[PDB]
Design a protein around this ligand. Structure first.
Ligand SMILES: Nc1ccn([C@@H]2O[C@H](COP(=O)(O)OP(=O)(O)OP(=O)(O)O)[C@@H](O)[C@H]2O)c(=O)n1
Ligand SMILES: Nc1ccn([C@@H]2O[C@H](COP(=O)(O)OP(=O)(O)OP(=O)(O)O)[C@@H](O)[C@H]2O)c(=O)n1
Ligand SMILES: O=C(CP(=O)(O)O)NCCNC(=O)CP(=O)(O)O
Ligand SMILES: O=C(CP(=O)(O)O)NCCNC(=O)CP(=O)(O)O
Ligand SMILES: O=C(CP(=O)(O)O)NCCNC(=O)CP(=O)(O)O
Ligand SMILES: O=C(CP(=O)(O)O)NCCNC(=O)CP(=O)(O)O
Ligand SMILES: [Zn+2]
Ligand SMILES: [Zn+2]
Lengths: 152, 310, 310, 152, 310, 310
């Protein structure tokens, strides 16, 4: 747990997303609507790291993430580690890996794409291009750099 | 049932080489032996949120040639059930409780794919979705190439005009790239060159292609000369004046042509093909438009009739 | 012949409870057992002097499902035979020498009744006449209520939205008032309350009704929650902002709902029904639109076919 | 509302927003861009308390809030306690008072308000009424019930 | 410098009783002693984003009567300063580098206020911003009341017509309520009633107001009978026809009017004041419009000159 | 008489470095010492065959600041002087018998030049002729460069955006190239590149220019960063979205800018300059527009008065 020199926050059971780069923790909570629950949540932002210098930490009680759900974290916190804690001890440790699809959170940059005025969830097929990631809209079939899609 | 029974026809990229061949073989059969009652009792929606007289008449005629009934609309200058306030989703959710299939053309990319998510068991056929896909134009183009050249493999295909924005040349190129040994020649103004992504797609498949400034460089080895309309509105009047010459055809440019060569153009032509070309045995753009009826009939039959008693 | 053979269908007020039941029973039969050749050889005019894509497609589809042919027009942006100089009388006098029946929607009240006086032996079916009647929308609404609730007597019906100007809620209310024991709840902004004349009509028949500020007050005892579109154009933007909340539905407002409860909306919805409602078993507005085909088929069959071999 | 388990320590200097109603903590962090800083932050959501059942708590160090800024939380956490300061101790405690004006975070419900398509910050005059708060837009001069303005 | 020097004139809510008096005292002085060169060398922008011939002609005439030059435009079907996305903010940042004052009318509420945030040193005068304000119409109304009645205190003011949506009557009520002893009579169909927020404002200041069905009930005591146009465009044609009679004025209705009584109307009238009223000594709507010139001249003179030698 | 007395102002190609200097020296003098009566009794036609609110307001304000009267029109949807076939030639032969100078904007290239052939003794000032010229925009641009930088020689000028179709940047490049030691940096998508004819012109005069992908590469040395609007109307929505990022300016991009550096934009901006740039000391696009008035006044004063006592 974030141990410094006094009170430290450990949890009984649930999940712990660690090593989120700085200024990405609030984004994850936003994008993935993590706080829309009655489960207890503990969050530390700009925490000291050494494994870098700073970082964000997210703890969600009585909530676990599928491997697929962990992969959605790949574009924003590639180097994170998601911890499964039950009965107070880490039973699981996983890292996100590029998923094949990113749904709901990205917005298609093509302004004429039908996805915009409509009741559908965005969806892009993921294509690592050994330099960046390519996102192809399920609807307009246009492909863009993740750097452009993430700008919007 | 046949492989395409009850399937949505949205994008050439979702169709296999076998799917293409099946559509073409069915088209040839219907051309040779008509089935005016095949879709008797089917009611089809011809929904042109974006008006397109040539494509709509062609599709509707195909529906009637199989005996199906047609309901529909066009020029969505408003069309409250289409663009106004109501979502396309809601428009499709309603339309799909009335008809057996939906043929739709829309100004926004992905419209047909979106329709597919609200149409339930009702197949949707994409007649044009923005600058994205137009699968039936490509099917009638392939059918026309297969019919006049005897095959779809090992051809010398030249594409001329606005290769940059032409959704039709983009997909004909992708469709021919599912076959083997085809060689491409791309004749276009720098401002309107075949996009890099189609180029990358061809290199990856190890398919040969070259760029040429004019038709004459290649006229002697082409089996198909596919011309496209250079949208004047895009270019500056002066720019268009300075560049139009290399992208327009006269009969005199054909002295060189192979006997088997056919000139195709999705239409309208007018600024790119001189009318003196019409009389040559190479002119094949009107026969090409006629083949739209056989390709669209094949597609509707395959999608709406379980087996194809062909 | 059947009671409606060759009759004009202009206003819900000219239809008896038995007439309504007969239409609904015929609709159920055609839904269960289709008759694609019933009106073979009939030619019907689909005359939309006032464009209305959802209603026109629905009616035309119904015509085709019975095998009838269709001629017609829409968006009378002019339509020289319709609004320009020529009287509606003269337009009908001509149209009635061509077709077997006339389905018409017009922007002026009484248009269909006027048509009736110049159509000779040709039946006219009212698809909408200004803010007056829209009998086939009411028939598909009743059919949808009968089908989902098992009857049309002793129901708890809530009507929400623009009860003041909604011609559809006015006539559904009058039609349900021909049946017994129905109880009404009217949820609407003061500026858009159910008119006094419908209220007077109900008191005279001794029928119960109450006013409520929001859906939640009544959600637990309603069998049908009929929503209507609040025309934004009527209200001041700010006024609409301050009042919209009580007249819009989310799935969370349904926690309370009876299992049998269905939500209806003549469409388009968009500003009054959140899309999260679509997935509940209560959402029934698209099934309701689908029933328009069975109700319109029943009506055309009864009016154009002497007996109903049902 | 102490905590006999593993809560949150409590640094030298900063501000602690306590007694935040449930499902208002995150809203506060977004609306007021609380995480757009490099200072260490610590958040607790859906925590238990002895007078609310559940509550949200936020801690931001080396950061202080004026009586105006604390008043800006009034619409969301009317009974919160902003606690301030240095050398490990609460030298200041304040409750949100309703401000005379609220800028930037609200959205005018009037769809015809010019505020919507333009490079301006929303602005409302606050007026307390029996049963609710009246919010009057600076631009269109229309006044609405806060329940309507705060309406999603 | 006078209190209004270089001040923005956006809302009647921002003007104190003394400000109102100042403008009106200046209007009387310029009506009696014109200063055709007061603003020579000043250039003023007449920016009618929303077209309004009557208001624009009036305001521009006032500008010329003081010697100022004018540049501007009307409607934005004919405008490229904010057509495909330029913000109103940028349009004003540009224009304010050109002119000495901006007079603007716009379809969105708050537009004049937003303009002041980008016009720097340049005063903005609101000529109407959606359903919010129209301060110079109120100023011209007050000047007319003051001129014909000799005071703005202790008046019997009746307001008739569409009190719900008339921004002109809301503003005049707010303005008159800044003075003492005024009593209001509101005569309007229940559907177009003076809004509750105005009534609450009156209640809070202890100002007496009462509702009446007909002009007859208050004629004997009315000092100003302020008629408004009915926005029948929001009403049902039949609805309009049922109540119009109670909000229409004929000369015979004026039989027991006080000698000092005046009939005002912001115009256009049409169905609300019969032409036989025009000849009576009470008709004062054309004199009211002529007064927009002195009220508008006063406003420009106060805002653009430090001290008026009047 | 001064060199520009009674001269037509049609193209920057017709103006020598000394002509440019003369106009700019006059603009500085009138900006410092206004002459509100210089052109009293002159009537000037503001003929906007093609509507342009920003340019017309600017030009008409300049006319009034010198005391001239103005008559004119905008767009020709609202014009009968050349509507059903009257030639531009006849329209000008008529107008030139009325006024002292003609300011005109027109959709066809060469229109101002043709006008000079029919206007006799009356000078014509080109306010924009299709994709050809816009001399007063260039003059206002140069005045702004000269005023903020103190010279037109030896500058580091970057041009960003749509360099292919911006007639404004072609003209400014041509103008700046009449001075010595200027160096250009062109930053634009390959599809909207500065045209080769401009590059050739620069080469022929030994003027250094270079292409750069991002503003970052030249910020440290730029004196004038001239931003242009991207004509996305010719582009593909997706195409636009892929490159826009490299032609958009945020305040953070200005961190290493020279103290003297200025950001200019002919307007409207929208997607190219973020509003956070407006507050920096480098934002100079609104001051640039305000300068159109002094550049436009200078031009009218030079052309209409023999000798200016400035
Ligand atoms: N009951 C527990 C147990 C552990 N943790 C959290 O689990 C995370 C990871 O701890 P752990 O994997 O056991 O050891 P580390 O040193 O953190 O591993 P690494 O260096 O890869 O991060 C820590 O942030 C700790 O706060 C927790 O919140 N509650
Ligand atoms: N050095 C400190 C001191 C206090 N706090 C927090 O600031 C608030 C102070 O609470 P406290 O002074 O102990 O009194 P309470 O019992 O919480 O009563 P109240 O909440 O009404 O102030 C609590 O959230 C506490 O955890 C902190 O984080 N660090
Ligand atoms: O699809 C059509 C019908 P139309 O819209 O009238 O050109 N014609 C074939 C040419 N195909 C194209 O994609 C060009 P266009 O955008 O004109 O359809
Ligand atoms: O009749 C229709 C067709 P449309 O005119 O497109 O709304 N829809 C059912 C809603 N009924 C109404 O009377 C409202 P509307 O005036 O939109 O028809
Ligand atoms: O609004 C304007 C401009 P105009 O459209 O010329 O009447 N003048 C003030 C009139 N005020 C009114 O409330 C009457 P109306 O509702 O017709 O604008
Ligand atoms: O062309 C005009 C008249 P306006 O349409 O008001 O911008 N002014 C000069 C701006 N020059 C440009 O190159 C920018 P734009 O291409 O928007 O005209
Ligand atoms: Zn897309
Ligand atoms: Zn507002």
């Amino acid at each position: 747990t974030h141990d410094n020199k006094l009170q430290v926050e450990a949890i009984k059971r649930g999940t712990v997303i660690d090593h989120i780069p700085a200024q990405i923790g609030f984004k994850l909570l936003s994008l993935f609507k993590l706080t829309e629950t009655d489960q207890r949540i503990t969050i530390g932002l700009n925490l000291p790291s050494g494994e870098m210098g700073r970082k964000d930490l997210i703890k969600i009680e009585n909530t676990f993430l599928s491997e697929d759900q962990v992969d959605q974290l790949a574009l924003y916190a590639p180097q994170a580690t998601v911890n499964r804690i039950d009965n107070y001890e880490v039973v699981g440790k996983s890292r996100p890996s590029l998923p094949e699809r990113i749904d709901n959170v990205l917005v298609c940059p093509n302004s004429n794409c039908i996805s915009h005025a409509e009741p559908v969830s965005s969806s892009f097929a993921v294509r690592k291009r050994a330099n960046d990631i390519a996102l192809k809209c399920k609807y307009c079939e246009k492909e863009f750099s993740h750097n452009v899609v993430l700008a919007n | 049932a046949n492989p395409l029974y009850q399937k949505h026809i949205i994008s050439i990229n979702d169709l296999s080489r076998d799917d293409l061949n099946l559509v073409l073989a069915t088209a040839a059969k219907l051309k040779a032996n008509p089935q005016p009652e095949l879709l008797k009792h089917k009611v089809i929606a011809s929904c042109f949120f974006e008006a397109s007289t040539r494509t709509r008449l062609s599709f509707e005629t195909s529906m009637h040639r199989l005996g199906a009934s047609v309901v529909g609309f066009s020029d969505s200058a408003n069309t409250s059930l289409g663009k106004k306030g109501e979502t396309l989703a809601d428009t499709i959710s309603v339309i799909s409780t009335y008809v057996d299939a939906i043929v739709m053309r829309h100004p926004q990319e992905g419209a047909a794919r979106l329709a597919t998510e609200f149409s339930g068991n009702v197949p949707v056929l994409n007649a044009g979705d923005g600058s994205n896909q137009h699968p039936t134009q490509t099917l009638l183009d392939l059918f026309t190439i297969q019919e006049t050249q005897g095959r779809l493999d090992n051809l010398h295909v030249a594409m001329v005009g606005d290769l940059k924005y032409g959704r039709t040349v983009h997909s004909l190129t992708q469709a021919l790239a599912k076959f083997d040994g085809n060689r491409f020649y791309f004749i276009a103004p720098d401002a309107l060159a075949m996009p890099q992504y189609i180029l990358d797609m061809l290199d990856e498949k190890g398919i040969a292609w070259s760029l040429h400034s004019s038709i004459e460089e290649v006229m002697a080895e082409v089996d198909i000369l596919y011309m496209t309309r250079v949208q004047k509105e895009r270019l500056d009047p002066s720019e268009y004046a300075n560049v139009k010459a290399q992208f327009v055809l006269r009969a005199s440019d054909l002295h060189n042509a192979k006997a088997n060569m056919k000139v195709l153009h999705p239409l309208p032509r007018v600024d790119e093909i001189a009318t003196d070309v019409d009389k040559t045995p190479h002119a094949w753009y009107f026969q090409q438009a006629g083949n739209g009826i056989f390709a669209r009939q094949a597609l509707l039959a395959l999608v709406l009739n379980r087996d194809l008693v062909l």
